[PDB]
């Protein structure tokens, strides 16, 4: 059954998500405006991602055990996971109706052609949409969604990690919490192999991360594109 500790973890993660995800998207007004007449969507989506990096950091900080990490280990975990967590969290605005991310208005509704106008090809974008579709098909409980974000961040195998054993221990605590949550709270048939499926999505995200990285390296190699980015994006994603 779910221990008291485990239900505590869940409550904390739900709150941390509610504190860092504004389902009104009101802050989008502050971004450089979307332009859809090349790379016309890069300023707007660069800003979106920059905002989102900030929110993901604020979520990460609230993950039980995360603070016990070194500063260096917190830094490497966020650097490698940020894109993956933005892809994960983005699923909540994502809609199967038109395979787009719908952030409350036509201006902030993003489709495959918009992403394309930020400098990215179908080699990223097609697997990104399929990922969004498969995740949506899981119909996760919000509790599952926040746990999966946290397990994504606190991954022991990330490049640069120093205290692997400690990152492992934090994550195992969250993995066990997720496994037990599914067993106690998620009815069959939806529960069928749901943990393994959720772990497969984390492998999908590694692959998405790699592809995004290579297309980012290309895009940002040109200084006129790198200019349209934000300082946080350059720092977290590289230069």
């Amino acid at each position: 059954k779910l221990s008291e500790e485990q239900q505590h973890i869940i409550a904390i993660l739900l709150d941390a998500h509610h504190k860092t995800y504004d389902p009104t998207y009101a802050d989008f007004r502050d971004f450089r405006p979307p332009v859809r007449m090349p790379l016309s969507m890069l300023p707007h989506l660069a800003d979106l991602v920059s905002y989102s990096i900030q929110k993901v950091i604020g979520f990460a900080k609230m993950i039980p055990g995360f603070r016990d990490l070194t500063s260096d280990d917190q830094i490497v975990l966020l650097k490698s996971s940020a894109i993956e967590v933005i892809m994960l969290r983005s699923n909540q605005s994502f809609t199967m109706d038109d395979m787009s991310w719908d952030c409350g208005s036509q201006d902030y509704k993003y489709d495959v052609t918009d992403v394309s106008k930020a400098g990215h090809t179908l080699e990223l974008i097609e697997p990104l949409i399929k990922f969004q579709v498969g995740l949506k098909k899981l119909n996760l409980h919000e509790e599952e969604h926040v746990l999966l974000m946290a397990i994504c961040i606190v991954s022991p195998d990330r490049p640069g990690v120093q205290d692997a054993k400690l990152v492992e221990a934090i994550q195992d605590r969250l993995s066990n919490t997720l496994q037990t949550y599914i067993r106690c709270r998620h009815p069959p048939p939806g529960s069928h192999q749901l943990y393994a499926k959720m772990i497969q999505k984390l492998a999908d995200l590694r692959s998405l991360n790699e592809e995004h990285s290579k297309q980012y390296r290309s895009l940002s190699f040109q200084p006129e594109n790198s200019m349209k980015l934000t300082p946080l994006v350059l720092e977290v994603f590289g230069n």
Binding site: Q54, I57, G58, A60, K61, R67, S71, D72, Q74, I75, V76, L78, K79, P231, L232, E235, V236
Partner: peptide
């Protein structure tokens, strides 16, 4: 790292 903004947002 060499990551002042990240390090600052983290605490």
């Amino acid at each position: 790292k060499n990551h002042p903004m990240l390090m600052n947002l983290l605490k």
